[PDB]
Amino acid sequence: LLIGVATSSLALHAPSQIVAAIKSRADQLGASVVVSMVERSGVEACKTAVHNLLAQRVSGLIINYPLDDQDAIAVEAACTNVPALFLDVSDQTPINSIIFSHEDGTRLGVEHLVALGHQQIALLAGPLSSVSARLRLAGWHKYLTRNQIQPIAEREGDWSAMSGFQQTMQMLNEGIVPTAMLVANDQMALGAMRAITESGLRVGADISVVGYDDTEDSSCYIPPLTTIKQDFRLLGQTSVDRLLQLSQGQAVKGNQLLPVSLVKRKTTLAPNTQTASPRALADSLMQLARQVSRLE
Amino acid sequence: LLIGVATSSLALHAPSQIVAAIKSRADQLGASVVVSMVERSGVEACKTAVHNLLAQRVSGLIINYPLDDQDAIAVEAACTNVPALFLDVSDQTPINSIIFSHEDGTRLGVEHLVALGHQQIALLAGPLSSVSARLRLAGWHKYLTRNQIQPIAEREGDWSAMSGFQQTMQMLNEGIVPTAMLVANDQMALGAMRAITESGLRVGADISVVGYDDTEDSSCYIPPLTTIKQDFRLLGQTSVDRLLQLSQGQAVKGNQLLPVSLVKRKTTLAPNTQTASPRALADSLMQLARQVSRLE
Amino acid sequence: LLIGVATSSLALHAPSQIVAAIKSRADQLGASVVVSMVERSGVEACKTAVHNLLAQRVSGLIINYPLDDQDAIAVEAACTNVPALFLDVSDQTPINSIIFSHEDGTRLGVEHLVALGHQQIALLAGPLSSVSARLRLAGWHKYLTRNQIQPIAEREGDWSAMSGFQQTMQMLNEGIVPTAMLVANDQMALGAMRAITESGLRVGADISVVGYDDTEDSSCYIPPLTTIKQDFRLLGQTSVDRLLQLSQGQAVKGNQLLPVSLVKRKTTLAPNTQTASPRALADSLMQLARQVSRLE
Amino acid sequence: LLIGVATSSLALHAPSQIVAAIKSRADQLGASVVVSMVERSGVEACKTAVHNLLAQRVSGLIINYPLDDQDAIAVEAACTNVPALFLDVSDQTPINSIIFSHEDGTRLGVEHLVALGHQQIALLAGPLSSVSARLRLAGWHKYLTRNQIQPIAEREGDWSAMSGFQQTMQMLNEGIVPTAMLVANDQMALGAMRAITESGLRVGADISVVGYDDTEDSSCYIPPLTTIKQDFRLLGQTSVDRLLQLSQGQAVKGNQLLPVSLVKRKTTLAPNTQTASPRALADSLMQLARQVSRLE
Numbered sequence A, B, C, D: 001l002l003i004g005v006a007t008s009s010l011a012l013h014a015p016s017q018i019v020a021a022i023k024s025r026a027d028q029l030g031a032s033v034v035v036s037m038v039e040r041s042g043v044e045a046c047k048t049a050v051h052n053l054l055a056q057r058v059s060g061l062i063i064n065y066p067l068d069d070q071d072a073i074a075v076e077a078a079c080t081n082v083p084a085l086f087l088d089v090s091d092q093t094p095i096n097s098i099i100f101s102h103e104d105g106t107r108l109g110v111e112h113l114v115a116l117g118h119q120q121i122a123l124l125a126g127p128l129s130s131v132s133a134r135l136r137l138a139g140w141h142k143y144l145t146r147n148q149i150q151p152i153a154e155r156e157g158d159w160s161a162m163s164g165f166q167q168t169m170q171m172l173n174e175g176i177v178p179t180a181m182l183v184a185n186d187q188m189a190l191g192a193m194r195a196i197t198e199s200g201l202r203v204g205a206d207i208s209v210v211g212y213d214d215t216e217d218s219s220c221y222i223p224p225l226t227t228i229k230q231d232f233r234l235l236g237q238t239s240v241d242r243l244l245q246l247s248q249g250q251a252v253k254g255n256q257l258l259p260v261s262l263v264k265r266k267t268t269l270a271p272n273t274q275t276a277s278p279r280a281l282a283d284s285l286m287q288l289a290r291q292v293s294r295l296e
């Protein structure tokens, strides 16, 4: 009983909250989990990661890493005879896998904003060289389409807070001031939020943001982020588990999806990028002047 | 060579970021790394990961886990005839250790705080279990004192955003309102922030905050966290290198302290009991500008 | 396969960008390119180049050089067998050409200034030797009368920046001061901008300028300029596709016009005469805010 | 006597100004210049570029493309017997090549600021995968270090007018505010120049920028660039000329250096006007608030 976990960059919270979640279930079942982090590169990076664990004489493999249909299949055979469960793959590729409904994920985000009266929605996607990053972009460009609305913007980030921050100062330094944004994860929305703020914009009221994952700090990110949840606590549960099932005789086989949901919090409101004021705002500015000349 | 790591919960940013770095360095030297995850509960928890990692015939062992003066010893003996490096222990311990200066980290934090005219300072510590936690709490006590200052409050967290949040919300609600707050880590600092905001107070202008760590996301928090940088990257390469040196008997024995540095950003600023509309005001004309434009 | 391109001066931005574009499209289908630098000398030069690329045994020729009707007719005669494709000609020439709608491109530019309330409009053309420049000056002329205006000034640059400069500040020196200037290409607009500024006016607020091309750097001229966007990347791609199929029996033939668009930015504003409030304020308020967050 | 020219991206101004000269020169001797291109791949891309040209019976080969010491050496062999002149290389890579003085170009930048009284300078370097950019970063260090100063920042761009904008949005938003920047190319200066302005700073008077290359548009940028002139005409010339000489048995086989210069203009002043953020700011916020006041 020695579960091998070939995971992402543990810098990112998700691949981390997942491992914690894994190590946690293997705990009660009474099995041992052993991590092997895997490089930024791809396919072959993952392969060696795989080989290591194979050497430790692991029992089965949970591959938490981005792979294209083709790559996934490669890696599977790399494992030779050990049963390997895949966590970040197309919900189409043959291999055994557990995926969060990328279809429901986007559908919810999209429809929540539309109902809220938003029309000018901008998209901040993850690193398009990542299947999961790719499948949410798709679902965005579908559920907004079926709703008739079209994305006034589209950026590419990389799962970091800074990435979401730059791509949002960029988008705003050239004229696209929307009323809502669909971000590919919670860290990018964190940065995205500071962005929208250092710009005189009220997050939520002026620009509604909706993260995606609902990692831990998301509750405390200033406006407690309205985010789509991915229960990794329960993803590891089902994972370690099914992994046992495949090895110890049977299985279930191939694609198996889990649900997601809209954790409605505080970054999403009626469009109204604020309307009105006569010379009320003139009277406002007026005082700051006193204040400023109150200084020099 | 094969490096083994006993680690705290991979879900805490700092530990995840310290694990990720140790990775990079093993990578540059053609060495594999395997991580055993531990349940921050006790010394036994620790002896296990070690004990299983010592079954992998790992070449070096790195124990990044909060062991006590006497526990460390139990664990060093546990990691039989293999060199181990302890990362969360005390320089006050006869084990091969590499740690960050707690004496400076706390020194600066106070030094910076008193330097801006703050006198009523509140302390928000981490789980008093962590040697480190307790260490950081010793320092703040030492330096506030050398500045004839005694803290007006001292709550305790558990290293997470939500504890930083629950704790200040309680303090604040208790009539206790500081003018500057010293937090044990960036994460809890996120929480304290949100609380300080929901209390209707300008974080920076009214209550200045100083985390301690400079984990990734901090450059993107609300007003970016003025915070004690612990160079996890630095910590990474050293341990890895020294672990080889270690196997080869190269007596890089005993303790050795890495430095911290105060990163200035947007949460520290003088006590708002001086001038009014400091820094902020600027980014108030910004809001107003962004309202007037909305009307044309 | 192997395409040849007889080009205008490579030192002129748009033609360079078009070549770079054509290069990519070639690459996409694995077509080899080869460029011949044509001297502004004239059709006897653009003829030699045609003859030189024929020496190489090109499969198809793209000719982006500003030839005149009979000058175009004369060069195709020289395109023995190999199919030539003309980029700089008039839709009116009975050869195979692909160009950008000089109609809409001059239409919008005018409509944009008329709808902004301008009326004293000055024109800055390119060298009247070229069809394209003259094609552009014809439009401006048509729409201004059709919108009951007649340019108050009409100068002639040569596509370079310095022309835009000299020419404008020259007109400015004769005391001919307009509220809007239409310029034949971005480069010249860069220059005009400096002349304007250098002679004491706020480009935009006082004299507004439109461009034509939206070449690379345009996003960065201090006030980024509103300009007629011509997609050279599209041009480049079609050029090849057409040339291929064309040259490959599948006779396309004739002339096809590509669409353009008005890229709105910071140089086009309402006339200063009317309140100087077109905007001013939102743009102003905001950067004053940044100097208000610089002394505290 | 046919000269094959394997050039870089022609999107950039310098490689295009050099081709223009390359032809302009070859034009005088009664020689043909056939331009071939390379993407940003490296060696293989530069080699195909070379095999292509070899096909057309080119008698010369001018490689104006970034090659690493041993990569140059490969492409030379690739180049075969047909004599090759390299334009982008290091003075100590063993082949016949003409390069501007990276040593004096950086020396002049440095000494100019130092003597002007600049202490805090930032470094906007070019893509560190381009020898030009590298020897040019190193050079600046040497002279600054020689002068007792160290870069308060060091960013990396990619030669476009936009990377200049983002790295100055960046380096500035993250608090660094130098008083001089040594930019590694004139296009990247239009962005820094534009960034430094949109942040309430006066280029020249507040941040002092100094570009590199001095290309055609630089004398028309807003405050016209104090730049380092690389005489692209003298280079085109010396290039072709020397090219027919080695072709014709002669030599001086290996390194050859041309001079650089400092074209002083208006982006460099003595550090400070004292206050870009003073009293007026409130009086000015007033008339604004009042210019506001009336659109309601």
Ligand SMILES: CC(C)S[C@@H]1O[C@H](CO)[C@H](O)[C@H](O)[C@H]1O
Residues within 6 Å of the ligand: A008, A012, A014, A015, A064, A066, A087, A088, A130, A132, A159, A184, A185, A186, A212, A213, A230
């Ligand atoms: C593992 C990274 C690609 S990041 C990570 O993966 C998770 C599970 O796939 C979720 O996708 C998160 O949104 C994303 O941040």
Ligand SMILES: CC(C)S[C@@H]1O[C@H](CO)[C@H](O)[C@H](O)[C@H]1O
Residues within 6 Å of the ligand: B008, B009, B012, B014, B015, B018, B066, B087, B088, B130, B132, B159, B184, B185, B212, B213
């Ligand atoms: C596992 C916790 C002690 S968290 C973590 O560990 C790091 C390494 O020592 C530092 O202690 C960080 O402050 C702390 O946040």
Ligand SMILES: CC(C)S[C@@H]1O[C@H](CO)[C@H](O)[C@H](O)[C@H]1O
Residues within 6 Å of the ligand: C008, C009, C012, C014, C015, C064, C065, C066, C087, C088, C132, C159, C184, C185, C212, C213
């Ligand atoms: C062919 C150049 C002399 S000019 C160049 O060409 C483009 C494509 O035709 C456009 O005509 C540009 O405005 C002009 O600068």
Ligand SMILES: CC(C)S[C@@H]1O[C@H](CO)[C@H](O)[C@H](O)[C@H]1O
Residues within 6 Å of the ligand: D008, D009, D012, D014, D015, D064, D065, D066, D087, D088, D130, D132, D133, D159, D184, D185, D212, D213
């Ligand atoms: C092709 C690029 C390196 S751009 C270009 O190259 C010339 C080569 O000498 C110069 O070095 C310029 O500084 C740079 O912008």
